[PDB]
Structures are given as structure tokens and as C-alpha cells.
Design a protein around this ligand. Structure first.
Ligand SMILES: NC[C@H]1O[C@H](O[C@H]2[C@H](O)[C@@H](O[C@H]3O[C@H](CO)[C@@H](O)[C@H](N)[C@H]3OP(=O)(O)OC[C@H]3O[C@@H](n4cnc5c(N)ncnc54)[C@H](O)[C@@H]3O)[C@H](N)C[C@@H]2N)[C@H](N)C[C@@H]1O
Ligand SMILES: [Mn+2]
Ligand SMILES: [Mn+2]
Length: 174
């Protein structure tokens, strides 16, 4: 419950600032499912890129700190819990993660974590990051927890749609 408690505190502080934040990765899967499916190593977040200072402020207020600057964002820590944070940028009608499919950061809260509505990245954005993962790390070297979470996300979106998205990913990076 430590992680869930932390997620709730982070989102509460963000709500208070009218700061949208999207849960990502494994917690986004569990949020859209509305069920906790397994243990999650970190908490993945997407934030408005131009309001990064506000997220850092939340981290600090909760007793944490920025730990690392990453190629795609930053890592912060609160207690022993890691926050893996990626910016999204305003694109006329929504925030969008760089290089990701349109609709990556939906405005509506489309998931639930322990009764609490949460904004979360789209299924397409979630699966897109598995495609990257497959290029950066061969799948038969993936830890099994990611093999399984990928299959779950695919079953939720649907194999027909995943096939088309994967083809688009290949074409993009052809
Ligand atoms: N939007 C553009 C970026 O998209 C991707 O970047 C991911 C990043 O990999 C991802 O972080 C994962 O990868 C990092 C290494 O680069 C690790 O340090 C993070 N703990 C990891 O987060 P985490 O382990 O929580 O996994 C979150 C998701 O991401 C993928 N993933 C899972 N494990 C890996 C891995 N070792 N390398 C690459 N991708 C990985 C899976 O699809 C997973 O659902 C961020 N949480 C979101 C970000 N969108 C591309 N790899 C790089 C690209 O520039
Ligand atoms: Mn991981
Ligand atoms: Mn994660």
C-alpha cells in the first residue's frame, strides 16, 4: 500500500494545483483494468513539460528529490520509491508525449487506482513503449514480468489494433 498511498498523495497535490499528471507503464495498465495485477518496481508519470517546476515542487513538499536527468525526462525519489517522469507537450488540443501516438495523454480520467479516478496514458502509448523496449532490448532477454504485462495490454487493446500499431512503429523507424 506504500506505492498506492504515494500515488494518491502525488495526484492530490497535483489536483490542488490544477496540474494534470498521467500515470504510465505498469500502474497505467492496472488503472485502466481497475485492478492491481502485480508488484510494480517504480511509479511512471507523464507531466506537462512547461510545468516541470510544479512537479518538482510536489516531489520536494512530499520529502523527495530529483535524482537523475534522463534522456527522456527525469528520475525522482520519495522515500524508497522511484518516480520515473516524462514530459508531454501541448499540441493544440492535448498534451502529447514526444514521438508517441496521438491521444497519449487523454484529458479524461480513464483509470482507477483503489477507488480513485486517475488520468493514465492511453493503451496505444503504453504498448508503443513496449515496441521501443523490443528494439533496445531483445524480447527473449526481457524479464518475464514485462512479457506478461505486454500480453495483458495487447489483450486489452486488441490484437487487430496492436498489429496495426506495430506496423506503424516499424514504418516510422524504417
Ligand atoms: N517518448 C519517447 C521515449 O519513449 C521510450 O522511453 C520510455 C522509457 O523507456 C521508460 O522507462 C523505462 O526504460 C528506462 C530505460 O530507458 C528504465 O530505466 C525505466 N525503469 C523503464 O520504466 P519501466 O521499467 O517502469 O517500464 C515502463 C515501460 O517502458 C518499457 N520498458 C520497461 N523496461 C524497459 C527498459 N529497461 N528499457 C526500455 N523500455 C523499457 C515497457 O514498455 C514498460 O511498460 C519511461 N518510463 C517512459 C518512456 N516513454 C523509449 N525507450 C525512448 C524514447 O525517447
Ligand atoms: Mn522496470
Ligand atoms: Mn514502471
Amino acid at each position: 500500500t506504500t506505492q498506492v498511498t504515494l500515488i494518491h498523495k502525488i495526484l492530490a497535490a497535483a489536483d490542488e494545483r490544477n496540474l494534470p499528471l498521467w500515470i504510465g507503464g505498469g500502474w497505467a495498465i492496472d488503472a485502466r483494468l481497475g485492478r492491481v495485477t502485480r508488484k510494480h518496481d517504480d511509479i511512471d508519470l507523464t507531466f506537462p513539460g512547461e510545468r516541470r517546476g510544479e512537479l518538482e515542487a510536489i516531489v520536494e513538499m512530499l520529502g523527495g528529490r530529483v535524482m537523475e536527468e534522463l534522456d527522456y525526462g527525469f528520475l525522482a525519489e520519495i522515500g524508497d520509491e522511484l518516480l520515473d517522469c516524462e514530459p508531454a507537450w501541448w499540441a493544440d488540443e492535448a498534451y502529447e508525449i514526444a514521438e508517441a501516438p496521438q491521444g497519449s495523454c487523454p484529458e479524461a480520467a480513464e483509470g482507477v487506482i483503489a477507488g480513485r479516478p486517475v488520468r493514465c496514458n492511453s493503451w496505444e502509448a503504453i504498448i508503443w513503449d513496449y515496441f521501443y523496449y523490443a528494439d533496445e532490448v531483445p524480447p527473449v532477454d526481457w524479464p518475464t514480468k514485462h512479457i506478461e504485462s505486454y500480453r495483458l495490454a495487447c489483450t486489452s487493446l486488441g490484437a487487430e489494433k496492436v498489429e496495426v500499431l506495430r506496423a506503424a512503429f516499424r514504418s516510422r523507424y524504417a
